[PDB]
């Protein structure tokens, strides 16, 4: 089919500054017969369905603010948010409707850029009531940091772990534009009460040195 490809994948811009997203189609979506580009742009906020910003590649849908505009022809397209406001923080998709099947781009996530802030890290050992159940959940919390990229490495008696953790990240915070991350390491009660030192090593741009927070089983 016609492959739609966006650039960049993720984009960070300051309040009031310019945002520019690019779309390339594997084949042209221009009709010489009708002189139109069969291309649309949509905004998507988490939970909600997509909303057209732009159709015929360059026409703005009614009700959409004029800081959005799009251009390009044939195979090259560009959505521009001239002066980014907080409500413009979302995912953007391009869409060709030149031929069935409809195809879309992979999506460009757009966020508010802010100064880099380091995460406050906390560690949480499993509750005893969970330990009765035969399973152990150690939790690492990375609170209010920026930008989104962060490495969390679990070390048990200094033997760094793999295949037994899971991560989850907050949406950019409306108030301070930070992110927060929760990591959960899981063992059987058996493996848990077999090692002593449980640690969470965090690596982030705002941390001059990787921070490790930790506990000894038995506080």
């Amino acid at each position: 089919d016609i492959q739609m490809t966006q650039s960049p994948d993720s984009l960070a811009v300051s309040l009031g500054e310019r945002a520019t997203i690019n779309c390339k189609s594997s084949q042209s979506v221009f009709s010489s017969s009708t002189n139109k580009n069969y291309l649309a742009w949509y905004q998507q906020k988490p939970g909600q369905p997509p909303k057209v910003l732009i159709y015929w590649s360059s026409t703005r849908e009614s009700g959409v603010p004029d800081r959005f505009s799009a251009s390009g022809s044939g195979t090259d397209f560009t959505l521009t948010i001239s002066s980014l406001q907080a409500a413009d923080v979302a995912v953007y998709y391009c869409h060709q409707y030149y031929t069935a099947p409809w195809t879309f781009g992979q999506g460009t996530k757009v966020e508010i850029k802010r100064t880099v802030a380091a995460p406050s890290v906390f560690i949480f050992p499993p509750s005893d009531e969970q330990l009765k159940s035969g399973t152990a959940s150690v939790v690492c919390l990375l609170n209010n940091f920026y930008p989104r990229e962060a490495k969390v490495q679990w070390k048990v008696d200094n033997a760094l772990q793999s295949g037994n953790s899971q991560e989850s990240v907050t949406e950019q915070d409306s108030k301070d534009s930070t992110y927060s991350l929760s990591s959960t390491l899981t063992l059987s009660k058996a493996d848990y009460e077999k090692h002593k030192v449980y640690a969470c090593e965090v690596t982030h741009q705002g941390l001059s040195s990787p921070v490790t927070k930790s506990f000894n089983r038995g506080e």
Binding site: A40, T103, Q106, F124, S127, S168, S182
Partner: protein, 219 residues
């Protein structure tokens, strides 16, 4: 007032079928195409197919010609998408969207709110709620671990709605078990720990589970 009302959330096991509906109003139904587009969690939009609402003929995406059939009932103003031989990889939100033209060569100007479909071999289960206990920078973090439930969603509040600042409830993650796990945490002043009560209110409507768990420091 153009409107698209989609059927409620659906949970089905592998190899089964599901049939979703989309009820339109506020415009003459037979004059615009209807489209079905899905989105796996955190993924891009994928077109499943379309129906010419006047004639009733359809065409589907080749990755789906095997299993999807799209239908309409013109007196009902209603579209229907039926997916068969379901697999876990079909877990996604399924949007219906009205075409800009009667004929598919047009963008979508109206999308329904979406219908979530979860395909799993797991059965309904209520969560266990374990404390993420605070430990004695001038502020501490405490939380709740909502664990081993199915299906989504879960809601978490703190102190019956009174504590909202500093709260971060994370997106759930899906464990090897087929069960979901979620955490919700809050930063609070250390000075508060022994005197302010912190209770997390968890709701898992699919299993009729309502749970309040007080979180305190561990001895």
């Amino acid at each position: 007032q153009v409107q698209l009302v989609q059927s409620g959330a659906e949970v089905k096991k592998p190899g089964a079928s599901v049939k979703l509906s989309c009820k339109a109003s506020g415009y003459t139904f037979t004059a615009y195409s209807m489209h079905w587009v899905r989105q796996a969690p955190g993924q891009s939009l994928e077109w499943l197919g379309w129906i010419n609402t006047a004639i009733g003929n359809t065409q589907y995406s080749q990755k789906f010609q095997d299993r999807v059939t799209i239908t309409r009932d013109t007196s009902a103003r209603t579209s229907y998408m039926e997916l068969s031989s379901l697999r876990s990889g079909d877990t996604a939100v399924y949007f219906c969207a009205r075409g800009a033209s009667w004929d598919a060569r047009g963008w979508s100007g109206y999308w329904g709110k979406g219908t979530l479909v979860t395909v799993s071999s797991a059965s309904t289960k209520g969560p266990s709620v374990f404390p993420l206990a605070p430990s004695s920078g001038g502020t501490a973090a405490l939380g709740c671990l909502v664990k081993d439930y199915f299906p989504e969603p879960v809601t978490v509040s703190w102190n019956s709605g009174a504590l909202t600042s500093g709260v971060h409830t994370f997106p759930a993650v899906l464990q090897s078990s087929g069960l979901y796990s979620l955490s919700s945490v809050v930063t609070v002043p250390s000075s508060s720990l022994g005197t302010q009560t912190y209770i997390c209110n968890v709701n898992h409507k699919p299993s009729n589970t309502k749970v309040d768990k007080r979180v305190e420091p561990k001895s």
